[PDB]
Amino acid sequence: AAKDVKFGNDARVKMLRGVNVLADAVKVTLGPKGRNVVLDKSFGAPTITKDGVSVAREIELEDKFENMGAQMVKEVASKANDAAGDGTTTATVLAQAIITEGLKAVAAGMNPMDLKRGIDKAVTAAVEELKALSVPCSDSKAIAQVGTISANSDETVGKLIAEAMDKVGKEGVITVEDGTGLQDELDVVEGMQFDRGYLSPYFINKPETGAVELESPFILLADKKISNIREMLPVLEAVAKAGKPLLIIAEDVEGEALATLVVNTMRGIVKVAAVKAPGFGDRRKAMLQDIATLTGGTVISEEIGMELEKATLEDLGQAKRVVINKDTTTIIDGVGEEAAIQGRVAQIRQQIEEATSDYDREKLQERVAKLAGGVAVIKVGAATEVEMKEKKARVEDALHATRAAVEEGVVAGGGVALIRVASKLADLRGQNEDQNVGIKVALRAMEAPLRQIVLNCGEEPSVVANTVKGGDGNYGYNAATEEYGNMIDMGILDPTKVTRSALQYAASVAGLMITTECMVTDLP
Numbered sequence: 001a002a003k004d005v006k007f008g009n010d011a012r013v014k015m016l017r018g019v020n021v022l023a024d025a026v027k028v029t030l031g032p033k034g035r036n037v038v039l040d041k042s043f044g045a046p047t048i049t050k051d052g053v054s055v056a057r058e059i060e061l062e063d064k065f066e067n068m069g070a071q072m073v074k075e076v077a078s079k080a081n082d083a084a085g086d087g088t089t090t091a092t093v094l095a096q097a098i099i100t101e102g103l104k105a106v107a108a109g110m111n112p113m114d115l116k117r118g119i120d121k122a123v124t125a126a127v128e129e130l131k132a133l134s135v136p137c138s139d140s141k142a143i144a145q146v147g148t149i150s151a152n153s154d155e156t157v158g159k160l161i162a163e164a165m166d167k168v169g170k171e172g173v174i175t176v177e178d179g180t181g182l183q184d185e186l187d188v189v190e191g192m193q194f195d196r197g198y199l200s201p202y203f204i205n206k207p208e209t210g211a212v213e214l215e216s217p218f219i220l221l222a223d224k225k226i227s228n229i230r231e232m233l234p235v236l237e238a239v240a241k242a243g244k245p246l247l248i249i250a251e252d253v254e255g256e257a258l259a260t261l262v263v264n265t266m267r268g269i270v271k272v273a274a275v276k277a278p279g280f281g282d283r284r285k286a287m288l289q290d291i292a293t294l295t296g297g298t299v300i301s302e303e304i305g306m307e308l309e310k311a312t313l314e315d316l317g318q319a320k321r322v323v324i325n326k327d328t329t330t331i332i333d334g335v336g337e338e339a340a341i342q343g344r345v346a347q348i349r350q351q352i353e354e355a356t357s358d359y360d361r362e363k364l365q366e367r368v369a370k371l372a373g374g375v376a377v378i379k380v381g382a383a384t385e386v387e388m389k390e391k392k393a394r395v396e397d398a399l400h401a402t403r404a405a406v407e408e409g410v411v412a413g414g415g416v417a418l419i420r421v422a423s424k425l426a427d428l429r430g431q432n433e434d435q436n437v438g439i440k441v442a443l444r445a446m447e448a449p450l451r452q453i454v455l456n457c458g459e460e461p462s463v464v465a466n467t468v469k470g471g472d473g474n475y476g477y478n479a480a481t482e483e484y485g486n487m488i489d490m491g492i493l494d495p496t497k498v499t500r501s502a503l504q505y506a507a508s509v510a511g512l513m514i515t516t517e518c519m520v521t522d523l524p
Contacts, residue, residue: 001523002522002523003520003523004520005518005519005520006065006518006519007517007518008517011065011516011518011519012107012513012516014063014065014066014069014519015065015066015069015103015513015516015519016069016100016103017069018061018065018066018067018070019070019073019099019100020100021059021066021070022059022073022074022092023073023092023093023096025037025055025056026059026088026089026092026093027052027089027092027093027452028456029049029050030089030093030449030452030456031414031453031454031456031457031479032414032457032479032480032492033456033458033479033480034050034456035050036048036049036050037049037050037055039054039055039058051089052089053088053089056074056077056078056089056092064521064522065519068519068521072512072513073092073095073096073099074092076091076506076509077091077505079505080502080504080505083497083501084404084495084497084498084500084501084502085400085401085403085404085497085498086400086401086404086494087498090499090502092506093449093452094418094448094449094503094506094507095505095506095509097444097448098119098442098445098510099510099514101444101445102119102438102441102510102514103513103514105434105437105438106514110434111432111434113515114430114432114434114435114438115434116515117430117435117438118430118432118434118436118437118438118439118442119438119439119511120511121428121430121435121438121439122428122438122439123503123504123507125425125428126422126425126446126503127500127503129421130411130417130421130499130503131408131409131496133411133417133420133421133474134408134410134496135409135411136409136410137402137405137406137409137410137495138406140162140163140166141162142405143158143161143162143165143405143406144158144161145491146398146401146405146410146493146495147159147160147399147401147402148398149491150398150401150402151394151395151401153491154391157391157394157395160378161174161395161402163186164376165402165406167186167188167376168374168375168376170406172373172374172375172376173191173193173370173374173376174375174376174378174399175323175332175376176379176392176399177321177377177378177379177392178388178392179378179380179381180379180381181381182381182382183381184378184380184381186377186378186379187377187378187379188375188377189332189333189374189376189377190294190333190334190338190374190375191331191332191333191374192330192334192370192371192374192375193328193330193331193370194287194328194329195278195327195328196275196277196278196328196329197275197276197324197325197326197328197329198273198324198329199274199275200262200274202262202265203262203265203272203273203324205271210326211323211324212273212322212323212324212325212329213321213322213323213324214247214271214273214321214322215245215321216245216319216320216321217244217245217246217247217273217318217322218239218242218245218313218316218318218319219247219249219297219316219317219318219319219322220235220246220247220248220250220311220316220317221292221297221298221299221300221317222248222249222251222299222301222308223250223251223277223285223299223301223302223303224250224301224302224308225252225254226248226252226253226254226255226257227255227257228256228257229256229257229260231307231308231309232257232308234308234309234310234312235316236264236272238312238313239313240269240270244318245270245271245272246270246271246273247272247274247275247319247322248261248272248273248274249275249277249288249291250274250276251276251277251284252277253276258274261274273322273324275324275329283363285299285301285303286367287367290344291331292317293336293340293343294331294340294341294344294371295317295318295334295335296317296318296335296336296337296340297317297318298315299317317334318335319334319335320332320334320335321333321377331375333375341371345368345371348364348367348368348371349368351364351368352364352365352368378395404495404496404497405496408497408500409495409496410493410494410495411474411499412474412476412487412488412493413487413493413494414476414477414478414487415449415450416468416474416475416476416477416487417494417496417499418446418449418450418503419447419450419468419469419476420469420472420473420476422442422444422446422447423469426443442507445510447465450464450468451464451465453479454479456479457479457482459482464477467484471484473486474486474487474488475487478492
């Protein structure tokens with residue numbers, strides 16, 4: 001109800017204090033020689049971490065304005081992590097640097113809109129420079145390298161990912177799951193992956209991984225949107241009498257049907273999962289038909305007049321293993337005769353060699369590649385289950401890093417890429433002097449992360465940063481080995497996607513917070 005409002009300088013200093021608290025909490029973990037942050041818990045034993053994601057997630061402030069500034073920086077950093085796969089700490093420290101310098105400039109009478117324009121211009125130029133500086137990652141040796149360093153120097157993971165990419169291409173679908181035995185086995189199965197997640201986060205069966213995983217699931221393929229239950233309860237009865245888990249693939253699920261499916265899942269009577277149909281229009285129907293052919297079943301389509309009252313087990317699609325994430329889901333080893341897949345991919349082939357519109361042409365290439373590519377699953381083996389799960393986590397992180405590197409490229413890690421780009425962009429200027437001030441602010445901001453890494457390493461950062469700027473190319477300073485040289489040769493590297501996303505979101509949040517005039521929050 002009643003709310004307290006702050007204007008101008010007071011709001012800016014409140015946000016500055018909140019962001020400073022968050023960044024001082026999260027940035028001590030930056031770099032190989034990162035400090036430890038103790039997160040006291042009510043359970044009884046405090047947890048000790050060196051990763052910035054947990055510290056950022058665990059921090060809140062009693063003062064409302066500082067708090068909300070902290071959570072806005074936190075949400076942009078979380079967006080950076082979700083997009084790139086890492087870089088939360090670098091994004092947060094960059095955001096703090098830009099925010100501090102920009103607010104200091106604004107207090108000097110500068111025009112905040114011009115500062116935001118200059119920061120955005122400098123960041124766009126920096127992204128272009130990073131794209132120029134990125135080393136392409138296409139050779140299997142490069143895949144092995146990124147998988148190795150990304151997984152704490154696990155070269156075996158490097159190979160595993162290398163032949164996985166060799167078998168299913170750079171853009172193919174790859175997943176990792178638990179495997180029996182000691183050796184690590186690689187296998188490719190007929191499957192695909194579309195960019196649709198669960199409709200509600202209450203369908204999750206694995207809170208540790210945050211993925212809706214079903215073993216030998218039995219899916220529903222319906223073109224019409226699902227609102228009520230009476231039309232779809234025969235499916236639940238059939239899966240209950242068959243004892244198999246249930247999954248839903250429809251255009252959109254809404255109404256009390258979602259609530260009752262969640263309730264049934266929680267009660268444990270039968271597992272139910274729902275995933276949106278990818279695309280829209282008739283393309284969604286076409287790809288749903290492709291999915292039905294892949295899984296050997298048929299789709300509940302209203303256009304052909306049939307309905308869901310008569311849907312049964314024998315005339316419905318089934319799968320071997322499905323992993324549903326927040327944004328996308330993977331179908332693994334769709335059960336069905338290969339002849340149907342061959343016929344469908346052939347039909348899509350004629351769809352190419354008589355396609356007219358270019359956009360639909362690329363869409364057909366992507367659809368046929370997704371349908372005929374298949375899915376590769378890698379099973380991790382070990383002595384006991386605990387190190388097996390640890391290697392699972394390491395393999396997942398390495399796979400995300402490899403995907404980012406393939407998508408964008410590889411640049412020098414440890415903040416060397418940012419400082420090199422800032423050095424190369426020393427002569428950038430804007431329309432106004434305030435724009436030039438903003439550009440200088442952005443340059444110092446990209447300088448900041450390497451300084452923080454060196455300070456964590458225990459060395460004074462001014463001389464190290466100056467020495468790194470003096471060099472060219474990928475030459476930089478290694479915090480682990482306390483020496484300079486080529487950063488790529490030493491192996492410490494990060495995907496270009498991570499650095500680019502961190503800089504982009506740091507600039508975005510800093511520009512948002514600089515131009516803020518008013519602050520509205522609940523009255524304490």
